[PDB]
Design a protein around this ligand. Sequence first.
Ligand code: SF4
Ligand code: SF4
Ligand code: SF4
Ligand code: SF4
Ligand code: FES
Ligand SMILES: [K+]
Ligand SMILES: [Zn+2]
Lengths: 208, 106, 51, 126, 84, 48, 114, 690, 96
Amino acid sequence: KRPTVRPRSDVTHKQLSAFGEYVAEILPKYVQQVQVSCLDELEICIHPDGVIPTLTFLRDHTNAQFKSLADLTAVDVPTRQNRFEIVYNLLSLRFNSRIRVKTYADELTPIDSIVSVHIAANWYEREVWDMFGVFFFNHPDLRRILTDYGFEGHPFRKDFPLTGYVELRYDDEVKRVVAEPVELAQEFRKFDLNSPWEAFPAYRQPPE
Amino acid sequence: PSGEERCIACKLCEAICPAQAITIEAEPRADGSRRTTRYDIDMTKCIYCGFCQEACPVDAIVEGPNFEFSTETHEELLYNKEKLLNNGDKWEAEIAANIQADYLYR
Amino acid sequence: KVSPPKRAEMKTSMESLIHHFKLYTEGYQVPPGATYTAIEAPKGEFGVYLV
Amino acid sequence: TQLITVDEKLDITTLTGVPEEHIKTRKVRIFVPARNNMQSGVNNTKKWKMEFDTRERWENPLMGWASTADPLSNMVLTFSAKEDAIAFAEKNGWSYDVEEKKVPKPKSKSYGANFSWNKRTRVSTK
Amino acid sequence: LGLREIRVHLCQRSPGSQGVRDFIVQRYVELKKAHPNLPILIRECSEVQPKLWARYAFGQEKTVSLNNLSADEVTRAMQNVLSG
Amino acid sequence: PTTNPPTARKFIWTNHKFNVSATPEQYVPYSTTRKKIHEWVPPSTPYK
Amino acid sequence: TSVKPIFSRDLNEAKRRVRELYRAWYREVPNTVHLMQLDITVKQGRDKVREMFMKNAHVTDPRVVDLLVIKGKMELQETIKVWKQRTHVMRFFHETETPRPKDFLSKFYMGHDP
Amino acid sequence: ASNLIEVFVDGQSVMVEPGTTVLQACEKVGMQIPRFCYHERLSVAGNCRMCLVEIEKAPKVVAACAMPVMKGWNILTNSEKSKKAREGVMEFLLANHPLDCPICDQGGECDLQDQSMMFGSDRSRFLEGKRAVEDKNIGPLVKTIMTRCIQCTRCIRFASEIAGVDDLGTTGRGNDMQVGTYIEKMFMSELSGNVIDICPVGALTSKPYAFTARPWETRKTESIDVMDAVGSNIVVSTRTGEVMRILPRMHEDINEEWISDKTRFAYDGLKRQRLTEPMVRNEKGLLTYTSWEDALSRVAGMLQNFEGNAVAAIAGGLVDAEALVALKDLLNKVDSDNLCTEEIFPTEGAGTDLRSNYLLNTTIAGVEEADVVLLVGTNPRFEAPLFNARIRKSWLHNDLKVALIGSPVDLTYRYDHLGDSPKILQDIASGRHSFCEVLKDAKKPMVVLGSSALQRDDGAAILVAVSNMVQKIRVTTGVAAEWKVMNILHRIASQVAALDLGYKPGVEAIRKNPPKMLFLLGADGGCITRQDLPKDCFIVYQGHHGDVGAPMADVILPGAAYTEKSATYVNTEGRAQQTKVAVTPPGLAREDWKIIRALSEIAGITLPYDTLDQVRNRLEEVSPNLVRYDDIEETNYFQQASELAKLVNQEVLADPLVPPQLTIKDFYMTDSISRASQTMAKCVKAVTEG
Amino acid sequence: GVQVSPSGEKITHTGQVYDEKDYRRVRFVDRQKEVNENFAIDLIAQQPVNEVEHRIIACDGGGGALGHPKVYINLDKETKTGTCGYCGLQFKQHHH
Ligand code: SF4
Ligand code: SF4
Ligand code: SF4
Ligand code: SF4
Ligand code: FES
Ligand SMILES: [K+]
Ligand SMILES: [Zn+2]
């Protein structure tokens, strides 16, 4: 009706809520939270011990058939004890659906790799380790995949600086490409682009 | 058309520049006008996206149609206000015609 | 409040000028949430997980 | 069989990859940022911020730009709680200064005080 | 050798500084009468140990911890600092 | 621009210049701002 | 104060893994110097390996020690299979980088950085 | 729930005190109602109508800034009526608001723009022509473009209630109502840049800051002001390593929301007359630039040449505690005790031994809590503008009774002028005064003695007379022991920290024993010169501005400024605060304690600290309140100090108490940064001629 | 107009010129420091004051949507022309 607002269908929300209840009652040992967004996306937040059973159940169950892992990633929220939120987006071609599975980790608690469930998880978990430092148990070959050889630090972390700590240049005395502490001719000018007025009253957190 | 600079040092182009390729410093002029004292565009940093020319409220900064301006040193692509004003004076006969042909779409 | 107004409207209207200023300096505020949007790219499924 | 005991400080500085200078010589500040006095909006005073001490910015000889040498100059981290920021700073091995949140004091407001019979709060104009 | 400065660090509300507080309120005035040229800096804080600092000629400093000392022994420590 | 000449402005260059790179007429960048911090000038007369 | 281990229950087998990694690096240094045409000697490479281990020698958390061993094994594999180049190997020596002096007078003369 | 009423914001219960407005209840719940004319420290106006909200089961929206909640009200802050009201009011403002956003200094700092984006519509229906208003010329500090004004009367209420000048107002009627002055009048008081702060639109902008930067450009550094001894918390806005602006910071116990004009606009003096390189005298006698090694070598050689009493140091006003303790340690290691300050405090009696003897013991919240205030020998309006602003706030709200001994100066409130002679202190101590019967009627008196009054020759006599008077007041009124009556108001930022560290106040020791080597730690007051110094005196000036102390120095050492160093300053209350680094010192200038420590290492007596935290540890082990930041820990022993003061046997003079700052022209230039500021020079020229 | 330093270097419209002892003139040695010849302050000083009849005038810089945002200038002060804050054109009210 309204030309500027997205149309909303409630049938997808009902179906995803029913399937979330289904998965939650099937796996109460690991499922910690089930939510359906207003964008009609199902998220299941599980304990890190249940990554392998949850992913295996979602891939091999007759009513799930999430045989395709869309992607695997991490989100660094450095204000909780377990700062890395590991996100698995999965696609079911049989039922034309998508699901999201979340779990948590910190810098010193590795989680189980799901290479035995999906083979794309090999390179995806290599990227997660390279960019966040989240180790993965039982990985066939875990190593860096995008950073330079000998790169120190995991650059997608929040506390890692945007420009990094070292920069490369060709030194003619040693006839090599060498790493120096980073100096910028012009510093990256950060901007404070946050309005002091609340934009969304639906997301107003209660005062502390 | 009077010859006064269109730029009013509002830094909208600097704010919207996705590559942070624009550096602007400003102060009131001798007649009290709000004008820039530094307008630098690092063309080695610029991504040629037109966000500056579509964020400029007075059509001061534009991407004129010159593309054959390759240089032999890295420094010559670090434009300042004198270079940009000279480019505006050089290409005004074409930029004004392009804006005349284009401005009804934007 | 999301898309910039036309340039004539910006140069003739106060609300349009304010919105042009804020969209091209701060940008629109996106309400908090996460999504995975997948699009049939020519090379396959191109996905964006936006938080 | 899957639970051990660690009675230590939870130090991950050897794993973060930060050079030793930018750990030992750095000071961080944990604070709720003050409300910008040009505005009356208070939505930027809700979250704790951790920033670093300001280092040298000099003038570029070629162009006059603000050249810098420290990488942690634009690094600002957002935390929901002061103790969370404390935990992150101690975990990453940075010395910190903590400023307590300046909540504005509750104030007794009365519109009728502008028209007082005897008190000095009576205004002379509107 | 040669006393230059006395500093007394104490607490306003602490049992360990009670003798120091008593010493100040019943003996500091006549002490200042006795030595009206010597800086006896009384500094009080919330979470400091009761302390005495004696600064001498070339920057030397002797530190005496007088936590949980009563008024008479704080007086005796002060006299030991003043004499030598 | 013979049947439709462009608009004439007094600030438009009357003589077009080609690419002047690697010539003495080339463009050299510089900071266009003045000095911001002014140093104290000591007096030229001795105190004693 | 009770956490989940990664590989080592306590510091002893963590130090055992550290000794195994040091053994592997010590054996691999001469092969690296022979294979990549390095100006350094075998003594300098083993000294650099010992310097890196002693740089990390102050940690007492078994999980951190295990992750350090994992990272060291990753770098060891990057040196065994020739993925690190001559530049990547020589980046450990910082021979083009002048060192900042550690004394107050030199830091005062150089600049404002402490 | 005694004396509390339960109200609801969007159905959520909250208990509020009676008289709480709808806006205050909503901000207690946690939501900020839009506003333009309401300010938490101004009176309620209620004219901008942006705060209109819907109360449930009520047909008419109410103004939340003025309407108090009654009982059980459900405040629907996000209902359709509230949203429509906000959209309508925003449309009415932007109908006549001028399209000036690119050329307006309120670029990203605009309440009108932000509240438009958050609550107004996205387009305009206004098809008519806009109004335009001629600009005013109220002064060279505040630039007026009154076409942008939304007639919210915030500036009028501020100038009436806090500045206390009654010079602004509205002339006209209807759509032609214009804010300003009817006559061509220069609106120049102290605390006059706060109208630039509180004007929500860019109608009242800053003329020194004009067109310079944008708020998204500016980095914010939270620091402390050192232009006086109030210690106002400020934000230094720096862009690309250059100080761009000074804004206040919200600190309820010191400066609330405002700063003085000197604090706000004297920052441009940090860009002129700056010492950038170390300098030494030639063989001709002229100062020439040299290296740090050479300059410190010369100073160290002369220092190890000279012995204890021959070496002395004098501290100025803009000096941090770290440099003060470093210089004290250096002179103590060469066995020198002549560590003096330019400002004079009486050493007779207790002196600086008891910390309550030289502090604002009641503090600024105690000014808010007091009922009678007796100001002796001070002009607080210019010596401590935020302290006087707090006095005026208490005078407005708590009906404070203010009396003044000293010359009659305009304090922007009505007081009782008891006279200017210091013998009135003896009269009040004897108990024969109309103010004596006022005081015995009073309950929580406060007696504030000025450091400017202590600067006189009979400063000790004045201090002991005031102490005797305060003792008589305490024994005749029966006040509680928790209430502090005696207070000393300082005008020097470094003075309280120096007295805590143990500096002997005043240069009387220098005059008694003229030193052969002299350190001037930012000393630019000219209290000691080469006329009363010996002929072959070696002078080293360590400072940031070359004003009075640099030209008379043999060696010049460029130090940092308060915007350039992380430093410790103690205000009049005894509260210690630290400034953070906003920019770096220009040229070869260094941090002051680092300069002193490097000099000590070259001289061969190395101080036991190398980093700033170690210097703070030294500060703690000297007097451990310079590390208790933002702490207001109480002092005692006024009885002991008063007994010693009673045994002091000096006599007051017949000269009337005349403060040095009688007018705002005397206010605008007090220290080296103010004297180097061009903006302050323009202010002086305006209040003198224009 | 373009003026030269005692060093002979052209002074820009921002007033920028290197000092005699400034080493950064070596970037102009064997090259040229290019300065925009048309000074906008002088060019806008050359414009005649527009004599209008109304108390409030509207300026958009000319060309409609090709100019600057449309603002209104109040010509009440008879001792000073009203200057457009964007384009610098001056207007004066004709009281005859
Ligand atoms: S076109 Fe270039 S200068 Fe303009 S906004 Fe895009 S990147 Fe920046
Ligand atoms: S070029 Fe345009 S967008 Fe950039 S500062 Fe100037 S007026 Fe603003
Ligand atoms: S006050 Fe605000 S809305 Fe008005 S011109 Fe300035 S930025 Fe725009
Ligand atoms: S000038 Fe500013 S503060 Fe004063 S009434 Fe107008 S909008 Fe309000
Ligand atoms: S905020 Fe209440 S009417 Fe203005
Ligand atoms: K304003
Ligand atoms: Zn115009």
